[PDB]
């Protein structure tokens, strides 16, 4: 009932596959009255946190951009990873992505996509399972017993057709990616990818998940050796920051 | 004095090269009372809007920047441009960016920089003066008179040594740029430097300009033509 709780959950309504929506649309998934959902869709206007664009609809303003990205941490990590995700990008030709853990989910900071690249279900400022994804599998790896048991305990759906649901065998899993330095998880999202990712380290502690999307056909050590290759690369500029 | 006006007033004590500050800090900046000021910062922290590290220091919250972004115009607009201007990078390697109006300024959706390039002011989430800005006078040139006098109405500082602060002279900048399809700035936000900027359409409007900036010495209609080329190509994915 609180104005920041009702800002909030105004602001959840609108996610990666809606970016449009009316003042009455809002009110409904936001459980707000019609007469309520309009003041405050009406106020968040007012200040820019949203827009009414030239068709009528409510959408994030760009002045909420500005005001969550400027000198964020997200922004600062994303300028120190991106020249290095860019050289990735124009050798491997189709995704290059950065991820963060967020709540025990995967959370991607930045996405690098060529024009007719595979299939490709990771968004910026969206999320992926951690079991499931190859970004997820290399942090669940580095993350204390307590994370690693905590998300294993919970239910593990199916996403793509090679996702591995079973406790014991992500235990195996996260220890080969410890060794290794890298994961591939063929089809582990989608039956036409594999994602490859590598641990990004700052001040010994991994702190990101470099990875790449590409045809589960193609050859995986060519793109884990440009992955580790960046990784070093940013490494080195965190420390220069 | 509404909560929302002072959520956003704390929001907006955060900056491009402020990250970390105290809520002493944000109550000074936000010109709060230290007892408004912490109860608000606190709120704030508790719905994720805000973050407060090991260190106690207060930060701009990843729960703000996933709600910020998600779907959002400045994204999708962004992910569309990206690959055309890694392009113009490649071609021109000094500073390829992306620009929208923001309420009489220039606010930058993205920059890409080549190592030991040019002084460049532009920031990403930062803002340039409409009238002294490559990007600035094109998006004006098709923002419509209203905007137009608008901006030609509030002051016109000089920031560089080039800007042009008289109405007149910008509104027949504003008419060149209009039926060239580029406007050049040399010299009009630093001494080093050329903005270039050409305008990106969607739906038949102009929503953003693509710009490079190089140094003051350097061909202007190359870089124009690989600029109007990158257009063209963002045009096309946006239909």
């Not at 190859?134 to 204390?144: C, D, E, Q, R, T």
């Amino acid at each position: 009932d609180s104005m920041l709780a009702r800002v909030v959950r105004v602001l959840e309504t609108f996610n990666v596959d809606r970016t449009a929506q009316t003042a009455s649309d809002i009110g409904r998934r936001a459980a707000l009255p019609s007469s309520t959902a309009h003041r405050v869709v009406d106020e968040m206007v007012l200040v820019g946190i949203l827009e009414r664009g030239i068709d009528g609809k409510v959408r994030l303003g760009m002045r909420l951009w500005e005001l969550a990205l400027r000198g964020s941490m997200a922004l600062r990590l994303r300028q120190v990873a991106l020249p290095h995700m860019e050289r990735v990008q124009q050798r491997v030709r189709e995704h290059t992505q950065l991820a963060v853990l967020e709540h025990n989910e995967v959370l991607f900071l930045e996405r690098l996509s060529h024009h007719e690249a595979v299939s490709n279900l990771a968004r910026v400022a969206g999320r992926l399972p951690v079991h499931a994804s190859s970004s997820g599998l290399m942090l669940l790896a580095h993350a204390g017993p307590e994370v690693r048991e905590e998300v294993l305990s919970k239910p593990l759906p199916r996403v793509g057709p090679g996702t591995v649901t079973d406790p014991e065998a992500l235990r195996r899993l996260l220890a080969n990616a410890y060794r290794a330095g890298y994961v591939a998880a063929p089809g582990y999202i989608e039956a036409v990818a594999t994602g490859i990712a590598v641990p990004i380290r700052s001040e010994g502690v991994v702190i990101a998940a470099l990875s790449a999307v590409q045809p589960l056909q193609n050859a995986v050590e060519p793109t884990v050796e440009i992955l580790r290759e960046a990784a070093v690369g940013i490494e080195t500029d965190l420390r220069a920051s």
